[model samples]
Target: MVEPQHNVMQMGGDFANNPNAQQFIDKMVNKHGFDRQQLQEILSQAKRLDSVLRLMDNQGPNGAWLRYRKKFITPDNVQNGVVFWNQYEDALNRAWQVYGVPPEIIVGIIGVETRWGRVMGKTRILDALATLSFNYPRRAEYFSGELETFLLMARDEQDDPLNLKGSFAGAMGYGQFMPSSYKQYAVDFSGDGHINLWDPVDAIGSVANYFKAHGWVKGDQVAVMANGQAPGLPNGFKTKYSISQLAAAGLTPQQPLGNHQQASLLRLDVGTGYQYWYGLPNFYTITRYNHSTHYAMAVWQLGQAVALARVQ
Candidate 1:
């Protein structure tokens, strides 16, 4: 939540005179051989979006699982997910065949991230990255790296760097991928020789590819409800233990698991009490997208809901 302390005059106009921009431009020129003058000019046009910084600083409260889940796992979201899945069934099926990622999961990710691309973000990518890279010191290092990657991508794609828009955090398109993820995981699913994440077909393929690349076991169970009381285990979904080991700590999966099956015990706050579940490997794979237990669970549950609706 770093705040800028410099005066208004020192903040904009090619940032040629700004110390932070100066240092960043130097690094880009030295490290990546970018033209120093061009980088400076590009940096100057990048606006310090106070709104984006405010959005970055605002974080929701911890342990509000119910509230968080309710936001994305809505009737509207599920209905839209079904429609999206139906519209792109052929591409989704092909994605499953090629990448082993389910249609519902891809639908769920896009639904949760952008409401089926209805809200892919409004802020320009350059402005968002520049604001975060130099104005927000807490995440400057991470965002500065994204900015560099973004510029490189722009150059490679022959895109106008200032024309692309995305979220305040710099994630773009239906899948809401950061610049690095876009560079690494995006695919030309349409076989049009271009990777356009804004297109539903390409987004569907890219999301499936992302999951497969992240170790999503095809047809593996994501999570199951826990029936018994669970001990106060640490909140780390990456820690896996055998079913018997978890049962020893008073947690039992409602769905049967093999004696040697490895799973992580997850405890989610429900306001009145708590809900427990056993997060399987596939569940952990979902978390790799957003790195949040709530997010993964929401995606899984939303996918389940959408799939069920499609059948019923």
Candidate 2:
């Protein structure tokens, strides 16, 4: 087995044709202490995801909210979120106790991302990352970084980097974590000594840990419907505000807000028309997982929906 891999590295497809691929191969071997030939063998077979690029480049609805909410917040998703929460109640609560994040939030993420891991994407992780890392010119560096981290993580986790499968962008497992998030936030809550994102126990704990790390207030609002004009999302996820500031700027939350509460003013396109919200610190925090209004709204509304259905 090892000899074949070495032979491939020595005489495989010209990975040199693509400078980016060659650079990654060299970096892995030199900086990360990986076998050059093994790395070449892996990159030699990475197919560029045309579909991934098509979707990323299609520029669909940029951040259209109504469609996003409609897709992720239905009876089935809400009920399933509640079900996921109850099914993993013990681990969820344990995480809540330890991390100051909520079970509904964790469950909401799993429900939305993978339907509790029932529908993880079929793309092989290495191919997805490599496609984006080398060919997705817009964010090649970002994806390249993920690929580097992934190789290191695969070694650390004793898993096969090329064999894991995930979303088109290479978000993995129940939590849809990028390789960097996996390194930073994934946890071994099961206490079996490994952080397995596939395990509900680890997923729940890891989600909560990520939220806490991103500054989720124990009981703070994520976002809320508001009376205001539509506004552009702020710069580079620096979205933030004070409740009073937004209220004075012509946006007021449907629910009463504390005078000093931090918020991020935002707008969404519901089916009827534009909907507005005062996204609190926690809302912006959720966006750090995924940098889009539609995404954070889906997560927030899913959490709310699940909470509504959670009571026995």
Candidate 3:
């Protein structure tokens, strides 16, 4: 629900006067071999401070969770999801075969990221990434790294960096992948020699590849709601503890009869209270997309919603 304020004139000042802006461009040109003029145009035309700050102010961690869940859980979204599933069924099937990732998981990510490409964001990629790299303090290093990767991606794609628009986080195309992730994981599924995340086929295959490379296991349950009490649990259980440790610690799922099952305990808060879930290996695999339990849960529930609706 974070809305960006439109103040083009004020936004332009940050890029026009900042010494660091010039330094960033210089580094890109000298070290990364990017075209100076092109890079300058991107920096100049990108979103301004007031607008970017507005987006940042509203897109805090908790805000992101609420906005993401609400947008994805609508009835219309579920209907459109089934449409996407059928439309891209072939791509999903092929991606699963090649990468050993479930078709629904791949489809689910696309569903959550941009509603299957119906909403790919309107913010300019350069502006979004640059604003964060220079202004946002919490994850400045991460955005700075992304800005560097953006330059590389533009050069590789033979595209003008100033022309690409994407999410406020600088994630581009259907899957909303960051620049580094796109460079490292995106594929040319159509064999056209260009990896286009804007294309559903390429995006689907790329998402599957990302998960497979990150250790996704097909045909396994991703996550299930927890049914018992587990008091005074520690935080590291989600990331540090193995499946056996979680089971031993009394975090069991709805199903039974898997003594060797590996899983993690994930908790999600829905305003009223907190709910626990058992994240199987497959669930942890989806965390590679975004490291939040809420994010993974949204994808899991949305995917199930889409699948169940389709079946009916």
Candidate 4:
């Protein structure tokens, strides 16, 4: 979830008259085999202005961060994290060996997305995706792309496209993978003939595979705390900097690393003040899950806390 900075001024009566909507209808009819009436019906049900505004008020960069912190850091969740680790140690180890991604990170992603599958969303995925694709001005293109991908995924999996439900953004299954991600990276870890994202085992493996495919390296440091700034540190030393570049710019970590290592610099605000850290390739790899520095950091720290507590 990101902060909900609704561009209230930009919200308008454009859904019906927009050229994109016209083009989208054309694609649905010609490319995806949706009838004109069916397309209109789906869009009609999907684009409710009031619902779109309400959802918009609750999602975005900041909104996402608040929800993440609230949901992920509960005592029950931490205890369940321990239980999941114990129950899935073998699978975790296997996935780690095969994918170079840690089990804790995998668990953290599940913890963050659906609370270890205890709370899959109630929204109909088709409705949610359709609503955003047609109504939301801010990421309309992205959601439209997802809408197409969802149709394709349904066809490929032989599932009813109308039956699947998910988050407001149409992220589906245990790991909340977007439609495009499900198509590209989802796998049948149980070898049961179906790539069931609803199942924890399959979701776990899929997350690991996603991280691996995105270049997660084994034994690499994920992130480090920023002790203090160097005297002559260069300007613009943020997460954009590679590990080697940060090291060169005198942003070395408390933990030593080889000069050839690459990393990113991250800064987080926790209401008290600002905190800084160094992020390694693995850390950056985690960012692929949510594309937010704050999200990646929270996931990484939460994972470490869970792992350490379980070990103790």
Candidate 5:
């Protein structure tokens, strides 16, 4: 999974003349019953953004854990999250009541994703999706599918496909959902008769819905600091181990967990050395949003900090 970047805008290439573009248009028209002329009009305007392609190819090491952690765990972020929680109390509470997802997690996701929606993205959704759909050979099928879904979504929502903006990867709104995810998980939370990711209330409910769909336990522990006895699955965040089995193998959570609990051992790159943690099911659930242990930890920590601030 690639993180979103900024200041990567460049002039776009032509999708209007691409033969692949024509084929895609045909598919949309024949398969989805989309109007051929309308597809042509929309695809003709779609730009092939090189910066997005470059961003997709450049997934280097993210840097020290402290550096990544510092970006989201700021006092201002915590304060703003509290302010946001209060501003959207009804929606947040309703999300919790309905989805079993807490307010801080929703806030953390929004804050980390778009700074509570203040910094959603600068890339036009059309350009980003089109460029990746046609040009990026690696994930071309996936992106092309998203591009198709995006058009269908625009038509379904009665919105202008050309007007929407989002991340370099076409992930939109506070939670930065990809077009396909937007279709599957987005909600009309405010009961406004429209599903909008840009609206905070809708975004809040959508995020909560996403976590619940991914199997977020209502009051389960996300993760806990662990003392590493030996290297146990360094990249095993997706795999689960019984607490007792992990303890027998040397890695152990600082907090006491019952034998029935299941977790994965994660080793993170601190600036000086490595730190380990026992990533529980809830922690894995956060990773469903972004498949990175650091990302999940950041969201968890940010949420914990914001929750503390709200109570205090």
Candidate 6:
């Protein structure tokens, strides 16, 4: 006796009524075998979050590298990173030994993502995912797939979706992994048979595994300073040329490398004019976690800062 339109209204007004959403729902019911009523209840709780929409935009000016570094490489951040590393020295060292990702990098990543486990966002992940998945126009498809993954992950973990919190972009815990990344790389390093990104041991292990799985090389320099004029590097993240090929363009490395070893080139402004660096294989590996050149450098530098803090 429920009118379909009224049911749809209870399905969170216009969100459930979307033709594309219905198609997705049909797929979920048919393929994933979710209960239709439960889906309605969960989906109905999803609301558009304007703050999330605002956070999704990446429009910014040049000299972003300095801005990113300034934002993350603070004295407070450095101190906290030292403390976090000290607190988790056992697990941190264990993760490094296991994955070839150093403790400093592990701690730096968590520091940059959530301030050493202190500032994990308060956004309701369900609402954020649904808002971005259903409402954000630019990355709806990607967000929709993430939404599917989130729901499935929650079900698998027996978590109450409505009770969970995360970033406006649906990135969760200390490391800010999306649902798919969480499911794929997160682990039970604490040996509880449950992966909890909120737990430092598990989170550290997850980050380390994610990097090594992406081809991080142990004892390798992530990046190196470069001298001489550049012929201008292209946009995007990839190391397609060898050291010799880049030097041929007058982009010489400040440090020596084998001529056959490949590297990517980047020209950054650290509030200074035109500082150049060549990305090693390890640097390219870092970018797989975050596609931005600035982001990768920030993580690497923050890692260095944390290591220095540990020694002092």
lDDT of the structure predicted as candidate 4: 0.72
Candidate 5 residue pairs in clash (backbone atoms < 3 Å): none
Superposed model 4: Cα runs more than 4 Å off: 1-26, 32-49, 57-71, 230-238, 241-252, 260-262, 270-274
lDDT per residue, candidate 4, 17-116, as tens digits? 5566667878977987866554554454554446655776597123544455655676778888888878878878888988888888998888877877
**lDDT for residue 140 in candidate 2, whole number 0-100:** 92
Error of 4 at 182 (Å): 0.6
lDDT of 6 at 150: 89
Which candidate, 2 or 3, has the higher TM-score? 2
- Over 4 Å off, model 6: 1-16, 57-64, 231-236, 258-260
Provide the overall lDDT of each model, using Cα atoms, as 2-decimal numbers: 0.84, 0.79, 0.76, 0.72, 0.84, 0.81
Where model 1 places Cα greater than 4 Å from the true spot, the runs are 1-14, 30-33, 59-63
248-304 per-residue lDDT for model 3 (tens digits): 767666775265355566666555455566667778778789887777878877888
Instruction: Give the runs in model 2 whose Cα sits over 4 Å from its true position.
Output: 1-16, 59-64, 227-245, 249-251, 259-262, 271-273
TM-score of each: 0.88, 0.86, 0.82, 0.78, 0.90, 0.89
With a 3 Å backbone cut-off (N, CA, C), the pairs that clash in candidate 6 are: none
- Per-residue alpha-carbon lDDT of candidate 2 for residues 179-271, written as tens digits (9 for 90 to 100): 999988988999999988778898888888999999988987777778876443452235566665666667767887775477666766565
lDDT tens digits, residues 1-312, model 6? 854443443356447676656666766788899866678777777777888888798532267677778999999999988888999999988988888999877887898899977998899898898888777779989988888888888888789888889898899988988998997888888788888878888899999999998998887777778887564656335646667777787877777765437777776765546677777788888788888888888888998998997887
Model 6 local distance difference test score? 0.81
For candidate 2, the 10 contiguous residues with the lowest summed lDDT are: 7-16
Model 5's alpha-carbon lDDT is: 0.84
C-alpha lDDT of residue 142 in model 1: 92
lDDT of 1 by residue, 1-312 (tens): 953433333334744466778788779889989876566557778888899889899962245898888999888888988899998999999999999999889988999999999999999999999899888899999998999899988887778999999998999999998998878899999888888768888888899988999999887778888987665566458777777777887886777765437788788887767777888888888998998888998888888899999999
